[PDB]
């Protein structure tokens, strides 16, 4: 009955004009499966007293077709969360395959706890292991339906959250004792110099300035365990997570404009590359490159024995963007930096008229010529 109802309802979408003997019908198929439907048509005739194979013609005077993507267990949820904001244009670059990694990655970068990474992993593992059982069960518990329908995406992000949580060296503000340390034992402070501070410590708080000889040397693992127990830890941890998140953001935006080029190539659009992508990537890159470059330069050019009177990163970036450095206060980092600051901003400002107006103008001339 249900199949039959559906069959006749689909037949009701067909047309029969007053003279018409056969049924005229039209379909969208995957180009790869044009043969598969023609086989199904021939078989449909062969399951009948008919001899007519009901073969198609490929259409050319076409409106934009509906958009399809094939999916499976490890990919379906990722396509769904992409589709949920909007359905890609026909032939358009698909966010979903890049999203299969990057959504879990961004999640784990935010959700940076090693133990929660384990618990998330265990939760999703128990859904995947019980999958063949669970597929037979009730769906009326909508929470259970959702988390089970997310099981693959949830597992991936849980696993990456172990990875990020491990590099942050934190579950529940507890370290893992797997790493060594760059932290210095009390005997290293007792070297005549600073030995008094090891006695003051019996009564008052003290700060290690990370000075040479006293410091346990540059660190080769992820986050040093010591910052879990340290009272000032949030300053250090913030400098990392702030600067890191900024860098990752620039990178992801630079990937998105790079995807724009490849999408405009597949659609064969010279105007969108020339007036869009080129001035846009130059605008973005000139602004963003200096920031990331200077973040890396601070991490190499300054250290404990140069820490007092070291310049602010953020201040130099702002004074670049606003031309507003008063020749004074914080020290300049490298030779000719003022020239670079001026140049990169001016180069980005020169991109704007191409994006804003020159495309509309050449389009107006093209439409006036195409007559």
């Amino acid at each position: 009955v249900r199949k039959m109802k559906a069959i006749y309802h689909t037949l009701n979408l067909c047309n029969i004009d007053v003279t018409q003997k056969c049924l005229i019908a039209e379909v969208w198929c995957p180009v790869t499966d044009l043969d598969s439907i023609q086989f199904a048509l021939r078989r449909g005739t062969e399951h009948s007293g008919s001899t007519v194979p009901s073969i198609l013609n490929r259409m050319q005077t076409n409106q934009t077709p509906p958009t399809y993507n094939k999916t499976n267990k490890f990919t379906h949820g990722f396509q769904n969360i992409v589709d949920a904001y909007g359905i890609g244009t026909y032939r358009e670059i698909n966010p979903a395959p890049y999203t299969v990694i990057t959504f879990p990655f961004l999640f784990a970068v935010m959700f940076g706890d090693f133990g929660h990474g384990i618990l998330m992993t265990l939760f999703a593992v128990w859904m995947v292991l019980r999958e063949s059982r669970i597929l037979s069960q009730k769906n009326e518990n909508e929470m259970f339906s959702m988390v089970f329908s997310g099981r693959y995406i949830i597992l991936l992000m849980g696993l990456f959250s172990i990875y990020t949580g491990l590099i942050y060296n934190d579950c529940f503000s507890k370290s893992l004792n797997i790493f060594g340390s760059s932290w210095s034992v009390r005997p290293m402070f007792t070297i005549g110099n600073w030995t008094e501070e090891t006695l003051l410590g019996s009564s008052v708080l003290q700060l290690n300035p990370a000075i040479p000889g006293v410091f346990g040397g540059p660190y080769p693992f992820g986050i040093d365990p010591i910052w879990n127990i340290a009272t000032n830890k949030l300053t250090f941890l913030n400098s990392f997570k702030m600067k890191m998140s900024v860098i990752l953001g620039i990178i992801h935006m630079l990937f998105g404009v790079s995807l724009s080029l490849f999408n405009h190539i597949y659609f064969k659009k010279p105007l969108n590359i020339y007036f869009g992508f080129i001035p846009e990537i130059i605008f973005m890159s000139s602004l963003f490159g200096y920031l990331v470059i200077l973040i890396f330069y601070k991490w190499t050019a300054y250290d404990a024995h140069s820490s007092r009177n070291a310049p602010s990163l953020l201040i130099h970036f702002i004074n670049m963007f606003l031309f507003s450095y008063p020749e004074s206060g914080n020290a300049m980092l490298y030779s000719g930096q003022k020239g670079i600051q001026c140049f990169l901003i001016v180069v980005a400002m020169l991109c704007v008229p191409w994006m804003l107006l020159f495309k509309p103008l050449i389009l107006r001339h093209q439409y006036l010529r195409k007559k």
């Binding site: 384990i118 365990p225 127990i229």
Partner: protein
């Protein structure tokens, strides 16, 4: 009981044991990060580390005992989940 309580006891058993044994290890290796969890006193700074090391053993035992209650909860719940 019912299956809901047994499923809770299974998950709690697993996570409770996994975490509490890791703590029992981290206490037995006398790791420096763990100090804030130890119930030390002003007298525990007298003589040397022997007093604090005894507390690391006592606190490690608290976690092994608690993990034992989660193992007992496990065995009970793995029966109840089948019985209900």
């Amino acid at each position: 009981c019912g299956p809901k309580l047994a499923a809770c006891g299974i998950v709690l058993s697993a996570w409770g044991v996994i975490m509490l044994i890791m703590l029992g290890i981290f206490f037995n290796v006398h790791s420096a990060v763990l100090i804030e969890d130890v119930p030390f006193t002003e007298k525990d700074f007298e003589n040397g580390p022997q007093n604090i090391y005894n507390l690391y053993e006592q606190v490690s035992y608290n976690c092994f005992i608690a993990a034992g209650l989660y193992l007992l909860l496990g065995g009970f719940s793995f029966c109840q989940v089948r019985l209900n």
